[PDB]
Curated annotation (Swiss-Prot):
Site residues by UniProt (Essential for pyridoxine transport): Q76, G77, I81, T83, W84, S158, N163
Segments in the Extracellular topological domain: 19-43, 93-100, 156-159, 230-242, 290-301, 353-360
Catalytic activities: thiamine(out) + H(+)(in) = thiamine(in) + H(+)(out); pyridoxine(out) + n H(+)(out) = pyridoxine(in) + n H(+)(in)
Residues of the signal peptide: none
Gene source species: Homo sapiens (Human)
Protein name: Thiamine transporter 2
Keywords linked to the UniProt accession: Disease variant, Glycoprotein, Membrane, Transmembrane, Transmembrane helix, Transport
Effect of N163F: Significant decrease in pyridoxine transport
Functional pH dependence: Optimum pH is 7.5.
Localisation: Membrane
Record comment: activity regulation: Pyridoxine transport is inhibited by carbonyl cyanide p-trifluoromethoxyphenylhydrazone (FCCP) and carbonyl cyanide m-chlorophenylhydrazone (CCCP).
Pfam families for this protein: Folate_carrier (PF01770)
Disease: Basal ganglia disease, biotin-thiamine responsive: An autosomal recessive metabolic disorder characterized by episodic encephalopathy, often triggered by febrile illness, presenting as confusion, seizures, external ophthalmoplegia, dysphagia, and sometimes coma and death. If untreated, encephalopathies can result in permanent dystonia. Brain imaging may show characteristic bilateral lesions of the basal ganglia.
Cytoplasmic side: 65-71, 122-134, 264-268, 323-331
Amino acid sequence: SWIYPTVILCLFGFFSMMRPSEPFLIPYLSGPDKNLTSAEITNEIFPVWTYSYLVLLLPVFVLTDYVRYKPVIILQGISFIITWLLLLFGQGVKTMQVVEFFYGMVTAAEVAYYAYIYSVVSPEHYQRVSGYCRSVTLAAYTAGSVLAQLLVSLANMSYFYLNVISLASVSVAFLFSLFLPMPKKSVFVQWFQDLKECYSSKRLFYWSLWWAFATAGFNQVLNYVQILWDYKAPSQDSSIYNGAVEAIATFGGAVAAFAVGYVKVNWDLLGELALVVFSVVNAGSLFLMHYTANIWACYAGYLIFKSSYMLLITIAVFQIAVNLNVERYALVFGINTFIALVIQTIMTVIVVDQRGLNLPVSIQFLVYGSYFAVIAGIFLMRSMYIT
Ligand SMILES: CN(C)C(=N)NC(=N)N
């Protein structure tokens, strides 16, 4: 019953996220293969990704539910092929901006990937499926990560062929997405009112509020944890270690996601308790990374933070899916992701941008830990009052 769509979507999300070039993305397109400058790379190529992500998330939650979640997934499969074909056979800054654009399309449609499996299975499985889905994606990343390192350490395989393997992987994901079962059929202000009825759930305007604010800080930590590690321990082994300490971290997240799916625990009443415990765990882990001048303890702190976040976000997605009581699975996921990315953009503007605070990475993770400490504090105080 639920097994067939779940296996196909897990295969799609595995082969679509098994990307060996993701770690060595910067070495690929800043070395002899492309000679993109580091000045033109993070100031002209990468910033296009956030804008494309925003302006393509705008249709994705408006129109994903109407199209029954498969054409957007298929659009991700095609955009995966186009993105890595353009990376693989593209030259110049203008081309990589288009690459970024298609990557933003890829992620805005990965939102639909997350919603689709809820669109096809009964709510009784919504827990299990949830973990499995997230797990496979994380697992895929870890696989790709380690595979990349292996292909750089035992085969001396260039970044070009890593991108070739990435294209081969995401092309198989397109074939798996072609086999996904089609879900069965279900002015401006009116639409807004519908949104009000969609978010009306007490435990879904709360879980969504956690989703909106937690993943922004999580993305920020993902982006600048490499910089934090480089600052804490300057060494010549960052290429084989840093990404390697984020390969197992992701693996931990995977297990954490697989923790939600496998075990049969009533999350409806442990949801608040688990939310507050793992949010204060995220805060303590982020403070652990900043305060200790030892990269071995900071690695464990990052692993704990990533695992607890992945478990919490799996719980959040599951609880939003079951308590939604409307078909708008991608509308809530899409709007949550869009608001989270808006918060991430605003806060990365204030804290790390030159025109803002321009805080170094020494205080950046103190700020991130304070921010998460604030999310944990709001949920902790709200839960304490209710009781
Ligand atoms: C160019 N590609 C494929 C990216 N992953 N880009 C990115 N902004 N990380």
